[PDB]
Amino acid sequence: PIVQGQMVHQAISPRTLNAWVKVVEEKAFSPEVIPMFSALSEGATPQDLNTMLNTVGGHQAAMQMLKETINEEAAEWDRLHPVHAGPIAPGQMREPRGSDIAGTTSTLQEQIGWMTHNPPIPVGEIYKRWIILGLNKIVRMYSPTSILDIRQGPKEPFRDYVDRFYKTLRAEQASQEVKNWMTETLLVQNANPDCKTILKALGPGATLEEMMTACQGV
Amino acid sequence: PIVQGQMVHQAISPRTLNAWVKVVEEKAFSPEVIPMFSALSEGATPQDLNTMLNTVGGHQAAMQMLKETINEEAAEWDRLHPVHAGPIAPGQMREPRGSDIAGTTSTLQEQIGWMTHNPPIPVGEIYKRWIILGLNKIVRMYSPTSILDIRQGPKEPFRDYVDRFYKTLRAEQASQEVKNWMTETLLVQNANPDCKTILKALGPGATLEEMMTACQGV
Amino acid sequence: PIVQGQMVHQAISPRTLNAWVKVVEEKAFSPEVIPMFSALSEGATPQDLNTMLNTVGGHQAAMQMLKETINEEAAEWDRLHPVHAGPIAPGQMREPRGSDIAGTTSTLQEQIGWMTHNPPIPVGEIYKRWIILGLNKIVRMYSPTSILDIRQGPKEPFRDYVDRFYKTLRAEQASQEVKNWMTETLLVQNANPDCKTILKALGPGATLEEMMTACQGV
Amino acid sequence: PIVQGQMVHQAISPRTLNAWVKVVEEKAFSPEVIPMFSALSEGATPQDLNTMLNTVGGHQAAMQMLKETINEEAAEWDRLHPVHAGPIAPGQMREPRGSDIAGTTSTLQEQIGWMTHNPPIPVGEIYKRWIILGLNKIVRMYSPTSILDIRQGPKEPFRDYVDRFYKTLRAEQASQEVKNWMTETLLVQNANPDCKTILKALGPGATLEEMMTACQGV
Amino acid sequence: PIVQGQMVHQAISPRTLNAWVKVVEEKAFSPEVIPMFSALSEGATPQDLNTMLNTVGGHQAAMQMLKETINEEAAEWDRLHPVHAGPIAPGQMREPRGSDIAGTTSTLQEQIGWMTHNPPIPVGEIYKRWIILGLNKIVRMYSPTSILDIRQGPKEPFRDYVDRFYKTLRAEQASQEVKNWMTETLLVQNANPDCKTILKALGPGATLEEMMTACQGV
Amino acid sequence: PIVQGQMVHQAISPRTLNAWVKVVEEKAFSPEVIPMFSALSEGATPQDLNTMLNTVGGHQAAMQMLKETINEEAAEWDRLHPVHAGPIAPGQMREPRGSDIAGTTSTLQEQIGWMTHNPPIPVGEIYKRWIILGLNKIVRMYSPTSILDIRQGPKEPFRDYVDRFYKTLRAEQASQEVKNWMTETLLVQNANPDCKTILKALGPGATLEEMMTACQGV
Amino acid sequence: PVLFPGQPFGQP
Amino acid sequence: PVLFPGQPFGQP
Amino acid sequence: PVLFPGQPFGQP
Amino acid sequence: PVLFPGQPFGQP
Amino acid sequence: PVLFPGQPFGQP
Amino acid sequence: PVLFPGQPFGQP
Ligand SMILES: [Cl-]
Ligand SMILES: [Cl-]
Ligand SMILES: [Cl-]
Ligand SMILES: [Cl-]
Ligand SMILES: [Cl-]
Ligand SMILES: [Cl-]
Ligand SMILES: [Cl-]
Ligand SMILES: [Cl-]
Ligand SMILES: [Cl-]
Ligand SMILES: [Cl-]
Ligand SMILES: [Cl-]
Ligand SMILES: [Cl-]
Ligand SMILES: [Cl-]
Ligand SMILES: [Cl-]
Ligand SMILES: [Cl-]
Ligand SMILES: [Cl-]
Ligand SMILES: [Cl-]
Ligand SMILES: [Cl-]
Ligand SMILES: [Cl-]
Ligand SMILES: [Cl-]
Ligand SMILES: [Cl-]
Ligand SMILES: [Cl-]
Ligand SMILES: [Cl-]
Ligand SMILES: [Cl-]
């Protein structure tokens, strides 16, 4: 990554790599892997991100899907940023193509040149956006359950049922409004009768804290 | 975080993340998790705090409650800080909205801009206040016991009983004065007879050291 | 802590926190915990010390006793440092109250302001003094044995007996002179006969090395 | 390595060495070892790379093959860069021979001199290229399977079969176009009938995500 | 410690403390503990050395012996450095007494003042000398064997016998010349007959390598 | 060590020491220990090297042999660098004797003075040369096998046999040309018949890759 | 509202 | 008093 | 395309 | 004397 | 040749 | 000689 008043470049540390590898091996494609990745690659260059993606042993199907997603994003970027004709002036620097953002046709010094520019051309955060999108699609695709199937057991504590519910919801393929609707509908809709009657008695304007406090005794 | 004479920005380290994750997995929602969190996020930006909160695997009900608490705090902040009309001057910077304090509508450079200002707009410590409040409500809600139920066993050493007492008191939902009253009343009130008579003989103006020394033999 | 030619402030590291927590969990309230604490909090601010004290899980009775000791120390400090009337001049800074030394009524920037002043107002080392005093009282109170009860077994090597002796002496509640007397009296007084006769033959002007060399064969 | 505005030289850290050694011992010659190596040797000098290669215990046949590959690369470099006659001027520095790039006939200060020059003579990245080529040949030679033999089991989930497929493909000895052909032909060609019919029905213009979603139920 | 062009002060790190503690717990009072100690306290101040000595749990007899040795050294230093009458000038600094070298009557800033002076008053290395002397006496006193008793077994390889020999010799209480004599006499004197005849045939002007090569077959 | 534009001195870190100790305990005197040592002591001073050598527990015979080798090297150095008569001028510094290079008669500041000079007097790399030579003699002496005895089993894969071969060759006591001859002769000479006929059919101008590919099926 | 169910912390 | 039962260290 | 099957990330 | 039995190292 | 069998990497 | 048996490395 590159950290701050001038910016300074440093390679990815051994324990950032080890951390990422062990996270992939232990948790595979759980939702919380996406923040960890973004946490382990803050300020990183395309070379660092490609380093983290190449160090993945196994899971080659998911890595291929991620490759295809990055291909879509880079192609769209090239569509939105057309090529221009001429040699680059001595003072200036060319604008990054989709292949340069992925670190394929760009050196480390060119990426540092884009990220250190004023105004900055944040190639690392753009490439990070594409990668994180692909990771979203992989996580949502490898989710075994559906939000519609989460139902509270007869003798299951309300806390556990809500845990399962939002656990499944976090990996769902839905926009913000759709998740709002799922929360305001299926949660009370799929609760067990003893607690479901109480939650219906509370009303749709109740907080989760009041719902879990209400069904704590049952 | 951002550490000091000029301030310098650095991302959250791999072992701060690993530390936080392992603390959540091992101790879940014990009181001492709140200092550790605050210890692992000193000088942190909203992006770092959201990084620590997003890396939590499971416990999604508690994370939802924390989300709602942050919603209340941000809404109140917007009420207290009304919007103003006009474009921002070149030299100045806008004042952070409730969505900017949570890092939702603000970039990392804007948060650094608010924290580096003179006078500083400490968005990270404000967001940290909201988060720590939500964590207080989660800890107090997930406490299994009550301060009223802690009673000393007949053959239990006084040290163990006091340990249980203040263990339960630390997670209680009570103001400072209410905890003062609980300490000055229930502790001697719920002691076993052999030691309770001695503690009554000491008087309400005795220290805890004199009480534990008094009941050490019994 | 704050380390050196100008002083620079840094938060407590993840492995200082982890070190302190694991030391408390493993060794609880052994004497050597007090140096370790002081070793893990060199140059620390009141916020760092309160961070280390708040991260203690369990042992809430001892933490309460420590709280009371700090209350005594702060009250005495306020007695010795009377309040003064007036607003603080722009160039100057107020003198810390007992509540400011404990980090309760003082921010981090104010503590840094007191520690960076010339002459320095070392609030962190003062608060550290109070805390270490309380830890002394906790260690001495949780000592299971007494210096008077340490007696050498008939077939116990002299090395082991001396180890037990000074082990108990280190946790004793006694001034320097009283410990000198305990060493010059009880050690030879409570040795087993075979070795006790030799140690009496050496005389009270012998070193511990000559005593242990003398009783090595027996 | 040497990191950045002037460049600064630092030796390889203990945990970079330990990381590399443990990676070799655990994973031997798996594909993902090549990125890890390149990740552990970013900005490194020929001395650092030779340090990492010499710390390998066992696997001496592969290390010999790597030696021979480096011999080929260095010989070719000397062919492309002919010697020149004369003593080096005081201000200038000689151009590196194939033996200097491998760190055999060059000191550490000379390598730092080549990497710090403007324009830089990146001896470390060149030597790194040769080494990584040799590692490619070792990985491809120690691959136990062939891309032609990967066939989906009758009751094997499509995800697992694709995982095996691209796992074998990553270690294959083939150019980019040949791998494109292998992907667009053998993958659907070697699928089990139930899923193979669906994949044939999709058409050769389908993404891997649509193929795995299509065969998820079967 | 204090490291270098001006000197900068830093406290002892958590893993230096942990390293020292674990070395004491694992290896107790083996010879190689003395270098490790000196390795963990390079450039250290009296406060750091007292920190390392106070963090020792158990072994209180040896710690007492070390205390007495330090008392002898400090008393001798005060004898060699007599007190002088007068107040210290504003520009100058007093000369350290034996109590100041041990960090008892000196603050951290005074020790930094002595070590940063030009010419330096190296109080930390002097105190380190006294401590290392005491550690020498403790190691030599806790050695279970004698150099005179090391004899080669009839079927013991020569390598093992030499290992035992120099293992015992390293902990011996003898000057350099006495150890030279022990090596040139007892080693061949206490070898088993089959090898002893060969070593006698070599002559007293043979290296250890030639002796071990000579007795390798037997 | 001392790292770089001015040089700065730092002591050996706790995990460099721990790394070295654990390497010695685990792998004893394997060839790859020599790079690791050189990797853990890059830029080190004689004091650091003596620190690493003194922290070795056990193996005292090998340490004695290393001592004797260093004695030979230092004596030769003194022969090649004769003493000169006179006091050292204020601006200059004496030339290091053989005892100064080993850190025996030289302080840390004098070694830093020699290594920081322009031109540098690299005492640390010279002492490192002597030490590494002694380590070469120890490794070659503690090798259990000979290059002449390595023969391929009848059903042993060619890869394993080559691994054993070069494993033994790396520890051999032979010059570069002698190792070239051993490789070009004994390897094909001591292969099993089925593969030996193929390797003879290839010719002496074949690479190791072609030999191992040729005998892969058998 | 600033945070929403099933959505990451600090997301627009 | 500066510290109180059941209350964190360094709390107002 | 910028990435290809069986090829490393960030390779020309 | 500078060090005393039962007393920490470096204590006044 | 620059590297040789049985010889360390980067050795003259 | 510069090093001696039973004596530490780098000792006078
Ligand atoms: Cl279900
Ligand atoms: Cl519940
Ligand atoms: Cl579920
Ligand atoms: Cl109860
Ligand atoms: Cl008790
Ligand atoms: Cl309880
Ligand atoms: Cl007893
Ligand atoms: Cl004894
Ligand atoms: Cl005892
Ligand atoms: Cl197969
Ligand atoms: Cl599937
Ligand atoms: Cl397979
Ligand atoms: Cl014996
Ligand atoms: Cl032998
Ligand atoms: Cl022995
Ligand atoms: Cl053999
Ligand atoms: Cl083979
Ligand atoms: Cl073998
Ligand atoms: Cl997320
Ligand atoms: Cl708290
Ligand atoms: Cl790769
Ligand atoms: Cl202490
Ligand atoms: Cl080597
Ligand atoms: Cl030593």
Chains C and H touch (3+ CB pairs under 8 A): yes
CATH 1.10.375.10 domain span(s) along chain F: 1-146
Are E209 and F137 in contact by the 8 Å Cβ rule? The answer is yes
Are F199 and F211 in contact by the 8 Å Cβ rule? The answer is yes
Left (φ > 0), alpha (ψ -120 to 50) or beta: where does G10 sit? left
The answer, for A71 touching chain I at a CB cutoff of 8 Å, is: yes
Inter-chain residue contact F55 with E35, CB threshold 8 Å: yes
Q: Which chains touch K (3 or more CB pairs under 8 A)?
A: D, F
Give phi and psi for D8, each to the nearest 5: -130, 135
The answer, for D8 touching chain A at a CB cutoff of 8 Å, is: no
Q: Chain L contacts of E179, Cβ < 8 Å? A: 4-7
Tokens standing for residue D11: 């030796």
Instruction: State the ligand closest to the CA atom of C156.
Output: 8
CA D112/CA D120 separation, integer angstroms: 10
Inter-chain residue contact F53 with L3, CB threshold 8 Å: no
Give phi and psi for F8, each to the nearest 5: -130, 135
CA F100/CA F46 separation, integer angstroms: 9
Residue of A nearest to G6 (CA): A170
Residue of H nearest to C69 (CA): H3
Distance from CA of A143 to the nearest CA of D (A): 12
Distance of CA A129 to the CA centre of its chain: 8
Q: Chain D contacts of F163, Cβ < 8 Å? A: 58-61
Distance from CA of D169 to the nearest CA of I (A): 5
Are D37 and A11 in contact by the 8 Å Cβ rule? The answer is no
Q: Which of L2, L3, L7 best tests the E interface by mutation, with the highest count of E CBs <10 A?
A: L7
Residue A9: which residues within 8 A CB-CB, separation 6 or more? A1, A2, A45, A108, A112, D3, D4
The answer, for E151 touching chain L at a CB cutoff of 8 Å, is: no
Q: Chain K contacts of D68, Cβ < 8 Å? A: 3
Q: Chain B contacts of C73, Cβ < 8 Å? A: none
> What architecture is domain C1-146?
Orthogonal Bundle (1.10)
Chains F and E touch (3+ CB pairs under 8 A): yes
Q: Chain B contacts of A212, Cβ < 8 Å? A: 61, 65, 141
Tokens standing for residue F196: 């030996």
CA K9/CA C186 separation, integer angstroms: 66
CA D131/CA D125 separation, integer angstroms: 10
- 3-state DSSP call for residue H1? coil
Size of interface D-K (CB pairs under 8 A): 39
What's the Rg (C-alpha) of chain L?
A: 6
Inter-chain residue contact A65 with D208, CB threshold 8 Å: yes
Residue D159 marked ligand-binding: no
Tokens standing for residue B20: 């936080």
Instruction: State the ligand closest to the CA atom of A170.
Output: 19
Residue D47: which residues within 8 A CB-CB, separation 6 or more? D103, D108, D111, K10
> Of C75, C1, C93, which is closest to residue C39 (Cα–Cα)?
C1
CA D167/CA F43 separation, integer angstroms: 42
Distance from CA of B168 to the nearest CA of A (A): 19
Cα(J9) to centroid(ligand 8), Å: 24
Residue of E nearest to J12 (CA): E104
Judged on CB neighbours under 10 Å (0-12, 13-18, 19+), F15 is middle
Give resolution in angstroms: 2.5
Give phi and psi for B3, each to the nearest 5: -120, 160
Residue of J nearest to E51 (CA): J9
CA C101/CA A167 separation, integer angstroms: 45
Distance from CA of B31 to the nearest CA of A (A): 18
What's the Rg (C-alpha) of chain D?
A: 23
Instruction: Please name the member of E5, E32, E169 whose beta carbon is closest to the beta carbon of F56.
Output: E32
Cα(D192) to centroid(ligand 11), Å: 12
Q: What Å distances lie between residue F57 and A161, E17, E34, CA to CA?
A: 58, 20, 11
CA F109/CA E119 separation, integer angstroms: 12
- 3-state DSSP call for residue F111? helix
Tokens 């006793």 belong to residue: C65
Which of 130-169 (C) contact E at CB < 8 A? 159, 162-163, 165-167, 169
Tokens standing for residue B79: 């009420």
Instruction: Please name the member of G1, G8, G10 whose beta carbon is closest to the beta carbon of B71.
Output: G1
CA C108/CA B39 separation, integer angstroms: 13
CA B174/CA H6 separation, integer angstroms: 9
Size of interface E-L (CB pairs under 8 A): 21
Inter-chain residue contact B180 with H8, CB threshold 8 Å: no
Residue E146 is which amino acid? S
Distance from CA of B12 to the nearest CA of A (A): 7
Q: In this structure, what DSSP letter does residue C81 have?
A: S
CA C10/CA B8 separation, integer angstroms: 11
What CATH class does E147-218 carry?
mainly alpha
Distance from CA of F210 to the nearest CA of E (A): 40
Instruction: Please name the member of B50, B74, B99 whose beta carbon is closest to the beta carbon of G9.
Output: B50
CATH 1.10.1200.30 domain span(s) along chain A: 147-218
Tokens standing for residue C125: 């080392």
Give phi and psi for B2, each to the nearest 5: -130, 120
CA A53/CA A66 separation, integer angstroms: 10
CA I3/CA A46 separation, integer angstroms: 13
Are E60 and C163 in contact by the 8 Å Cβ rule? The answer is yes
CA A212/CA A162 separation, integer angstroms: 9
Which of 188-217 (A) contact B at CB < 8 A? 207-209, 212-213
Residue of B nearest to C50 (CA): B35
- 3-state DSSP call for residue E198? helix
Are E19 and F17 in contact by the 8 Å Cβ rule? The answer is yes
Inter-chain residue contact K6 with F166, CB threshold 8 Å: yes
Residue of E nearest to L6 (CA): E170
The answer, for A9 touching chain D at a CB cutoff of 8 Å, is: yes
- 3-state DSSP call for residue C118? coil
Cα(A151) to centroid(ligand 1), Å: 7
Residue of H nearest to C72 (CA): H1
Q: Chain E contacts of L4, Cβ < 8 Å? A: 176, 179-180
Helix (H) or strand (E) holding D108: helix D108-116
Three-state SS string across chain B, please? CEECCCCEECCCCHHHHHHHHHHHHHHCCCCCHHHHHHHHCCCCCHHHHHHHHHCCCCCHHHHHHHHHHHHHHHHHHHHHCCCCCCCCCCCCCCCCCHHHHCCCCCCHHHHHHHHHCCCCCCHHHHHHHHHHHHHHHHHHHCCCCCHHHCCCCCCCCHHHHHHHHHHHHHCCCCCHHHHHHHHHHHHHHCCCHHHHHHHHHHCCCCCHHHHHHHCCCC
Give the method used.
X-ray
> Of E28, E29, E90, E20, which is closest to residue E55 (Cα–Cα)?
E20
Inter-chain residue contact E9 with C3, CB threshold 8 Å: yes
Q: In this structure, what DSSP letter does residue J4 have?
A: -
Chains G and J touch (3+ CB pairs under 8 A): no
Q: What Å distances lie between residue E4 and A212, C94, D118, E10, CA to CA?
A: 59, 36, 30, 11
CA F123/CA D102 separation, integer angstroms: 25
